[PDB]
Amino acid sequence: MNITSQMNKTIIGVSVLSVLVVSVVAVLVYKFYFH
Fold first, then answer.
1. Rounded to an integer, what distance in angstroms lies between the CA atom of residue 30 and that of residue 33?
2. What sign results for the dihedral spanned by CA atoms 8, 9, 12, 13?
3. CB neighbour burial string for 6-35, b if at least 16 within 10 angstroms, e if fewer
4. How far is the C-alpha of 34 from the C-alpha of 23, rounded, in Å?
5. I need a surface site. Which of 1, 9, 28, 30 has the fewest CB within 10 A?
């Protein structure tokens, strides 16, 4: 079980990139289909 001891900064970065990306897509379709 991860005890939130330490984490790589690089990991956080990519994580955010995937967050926005995914979100954007969901929105693009939401409008492109249900504008």
1. 6
2. negative
3. eeeeeeeeeeeeeeeeeeeeeeeeeeeeee
4. 16
5. 1
What is the dihedral sign for C-alpha 12, 3, 23, 21?
A: positive
* CA distances to 6, 10, 19, 20, 31 from 3, in Å: 8, 19, 23, 27, 41
- The method of structure determination was NMR
The string of DSSP letters for the chain reads ---S----HHHHHHHHHHHHHHHHHHHHHHHHHH-
Half-sphere exposure for 30 (CA within 13 Å, toward CB): 6
